[PDB]
Amino acid sequence: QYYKIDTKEEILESARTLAYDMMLFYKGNQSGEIPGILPGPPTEHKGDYYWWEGGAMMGTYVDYWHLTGDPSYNHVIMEGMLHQVGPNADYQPPNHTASLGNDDQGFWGMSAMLAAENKFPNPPDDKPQWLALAQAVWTTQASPERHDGTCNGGLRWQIPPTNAGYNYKNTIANACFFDLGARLARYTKNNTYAEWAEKIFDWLYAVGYIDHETWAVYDGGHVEHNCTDINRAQFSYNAALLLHGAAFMWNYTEDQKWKDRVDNLLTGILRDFFKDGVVFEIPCEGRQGACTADMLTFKGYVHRWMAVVTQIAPHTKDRILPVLRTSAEAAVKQCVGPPTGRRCGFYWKSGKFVDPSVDHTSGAGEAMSVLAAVSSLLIEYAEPPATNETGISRGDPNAGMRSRGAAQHF
Numbered sequence: 001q002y003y004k005i006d007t008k009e010e011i012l013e014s015a016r017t018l019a020y021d022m023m024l025f026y027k028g029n030q031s032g033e034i035p036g037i038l039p040g041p042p043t044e045h046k047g048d049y050y051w052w053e054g055g056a057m058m059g060t061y062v063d064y065w066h067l068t069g070d071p072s073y074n075h076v077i078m079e080g081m082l083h084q085v086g087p088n089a090d091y092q093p094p095n096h097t098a099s100l101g102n103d104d105q106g107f108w109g110m111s112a113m114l115a116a117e118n119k120f121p122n123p124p125d126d127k128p129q130w131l132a133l134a135q136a137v138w139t140t141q142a143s144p145e146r147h148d149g150t151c152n153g154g155l156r157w158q159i160p161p162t163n164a165g166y167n168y169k170n171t172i173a174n175a176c177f178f179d180l181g182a183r184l185a186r187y188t189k190n191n192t193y194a195e196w197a198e199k200i201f202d203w204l205y206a207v208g209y210i211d212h213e214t215w216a217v218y219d220g221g222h223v224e225h226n227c228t229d230i231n232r233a234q235f236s237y238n239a240a241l242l243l244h245g246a247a248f249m250w251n252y253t254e255d256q257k258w259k260d261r262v263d264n265l266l267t268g269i270l271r272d273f274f275k276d277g278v279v280f281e282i283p284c285e286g287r288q289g290a291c292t293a294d295m296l297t298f299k300g301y302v303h304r305w306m307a308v309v310t311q312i313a314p315h316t317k318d319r320i321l322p323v324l325r326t327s328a329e330a331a332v333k334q335c336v337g338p339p340t341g342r343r344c345g346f347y348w349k350s351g352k353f354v355d356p357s358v359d360h361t362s363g364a365g366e367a368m369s370v371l372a373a374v375s376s377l378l379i380e381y382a383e384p385p386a387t388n389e390t391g392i393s394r395g396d397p398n399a400g401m402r403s404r405g406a407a408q409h410f
């Protein structure tokens with residue numbers, strides 16, 4: 001094994017080297033390149049990765065700095081986050097319409113929310129601020145045209161009505177909106193965010209994407225079938241994102257119903273995604289060559305989000321931290337690949353390095369996921385998410401409401 005993680009100092013060193021290796025995939029700070037994105041999209045044969053994964057990377061590095069204190073990449077991350085905000089400061093840059101799902105926009109909004117929670121350095125005074133960016137994403141997702149009567153509510157996967165998948169009302173789009181609402185409520189203490197989060201969670205429960213018996217979290221359903229054709233694929237990031245948002249709602253409301261939802265979602269996640277202590281992407285990881293670029297990132301979010309759950313729902317700490325530890329141990333045990341002797345693959349439970357070429361990418365998602373898992377081993381030393389009591393960001397009451405905003409020509 002190359003990376004050591006037995007003490008705080010070893011974890012810090014390993015995380016620093018993992019942050020270096022993940023950054024090698026990113027070209028956006030170089031002359032002539034586009035800040036904020038990994039190479040791609042694959043539809044243009046420019047690389048393996050879609051725009052939203054750039055947003056996920058940005059968030060991973062906001063967390064990296066928060067967890068380790070290393071600010072080395074902060075300027076690169078600030079540039080990338082600011083470059084992708086779009087003309088209306090809402091993470092809807094029109095050049096990216098083709099991949100503009102509510103989840104894609106949502107992941108960028110969640111990285112901005114994380115920047116506010118982590119007190120990431122503020123953009124310059126003339127630029128959009130982190131809280132305001134999160135508020136803009138949430139506001140556009142709350143806009144009435146995104147909430148029609150099909151399936152009695154819920155967000156559709158896609159924002160543009162002509163995008164493939166507009167007829168699919170899926171968990172992840174709704175989970176992003178839920179998580180943002182819960183986090184905006186806790187940060188700002190504004191209850192309208194929380195009321196929307198309650199409504200969306202109740203919808204996810206009612207439509208049955210959350211299994212009422214097992215608390216498994218399914219993928220979605222289509223409007224032409226009243227959302228009853230549930231796709232029962234269980235992706236780790238769906239359950240984990242609902243757990244994360246539910247923990248924010250528990251912390252904000254102190255309502256036992258939210259504690260119960262945290263506990264039930266957590267029981268399900270441990271049952272379904274952790275195999276002898278190691279996170280496992282059950283829809284695809286059981287055979288090599290099936291996981292897509294998107295799926296290779298999910299276990300990193302699971303680690304980072306579950307770690308934060310232990311801070312804001314501290315009664316979960318003893319259920320979560322030991323399991324994240326064994327999962328991160330498996331992650332580093334297989335980061336031994338050539339040519340460096342430390343290249344990371346995806347198949348942590350297997351105990352062996354598998355070249356990322358088996359899943360047809362250069363390996364950035366695997367690198368991101370290991371960075372996330374190792375960094376998050378430092379959660380016990382980190383500050384919890386800030387609120388407006390101690391945060392340094394600034395909001396905008398008209399976030400998402402510009403007169404040229406895309407909702408005005410929907």
Ligand SMILES: OC[C@H]1O[C@@H](O[C@@H]2[C@@H](O)[C@H](O)O[C@H](CO)[C@H]2O)[C@H](O)[C@@H](O)[C@@H]1O
Pocket residue numbers: 043050052098099100101103104158163294
């Ligand atoms: O899975 C990542 C992203 O996939 C997007 O759909 C792709 C389109 O952007 C592209 O134009 O065509 C391919 C199929 O040829 C689609 O897979 C979604 O729009 C994104 O939300 C999604 O995150």
Ligand SMILES: [Ca+2]
Pocket residue numbers: 042047048360361362
């Ligand atoms: Ca490829």
